[PDB]
Amino acid sequence: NISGKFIQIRQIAGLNSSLKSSGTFKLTNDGSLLWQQQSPIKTTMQMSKNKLTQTIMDNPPTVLTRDDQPIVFTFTSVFMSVFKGDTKTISEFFNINFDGNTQNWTITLTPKSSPLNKAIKEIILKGNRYITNIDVADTQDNIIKIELFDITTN
Ligand SMILES: [Cl-]
Ligand SMILES: [Cl-]
Ligand SMILES: [Mg+2]
Ligand SMILES: [Mg+2]
């Protein structure tokens, strides 16, 4: 399994500040992701058996869908795919550009087609041994910037 920490910074066009959050993630032996936001408000996302669910604070969980939550759904799928090296699946949905080397690389993903290209402008991944940064730009001038750190494989 792979676990780590994240800081997320959301830059929304038209807001005069960025929205910051942070937490942990765990990729388990069985193809599951547990994403736990711990600050400033607790939320949890889980991908298990290709089902994506989210819990906000103590509220009941809901299912997130490709159709209604395309950016989150795609982020989560790409995240899992890159950690397991599954560029085959990524390539079904994205053009892939790779620049760099094992110590410093950047992967640029642009969507091949609709409907994904109605929601996502590009996803940029940067890293070394692991992903260190993920930027998700939508088609409406908003950008989510995620930093991953304290990643350990055990
Ligand atoms: Cl639901
Ligand atoms: Cl979304
Ligand atoms: Mg729907
Ligand atoms: Mg980043």
Domain boundaries, the chain: 2-147
128 CA distance to ligand 4 middle (Å) = 14
Q: How many CB atoms lie within 10 A of CB 79?
A: 23
Residue 67 assigned to a binding site: yes
Lookup: tokens for 74: 């795609």
Residue 86 assigned to a binding site: no
The CATH architecture of the domain made up of 2-147 is Clam (2.50)
Distance spanning both ends of the chain, measured CA to CA? 6
63 CA distance to ligand 4 middle (Å) = 26
Rounded to whole angstroms, how far apart are CA atoms 118 and 123? Answer: 14
72 CA distance to ligand 2 middle (Å) = 5
Secondary structure (DSSP) of the chain: -EEEEEEEEEE-TT-SS-EEEEEEEEE-TTS-EEEEEEESS-EEEEEETTEEEEEETTSPPEEE-TTTSHHHHHHHHHHHHHHTT-HHHHHHHEEEEEEEETTEEEEEEEE-STTHHHHEEEEEEEESSSEEEEEEEETTS-EEEEEEEEEEE-
111 CA distance to ligand 2 middle (Å) = 15
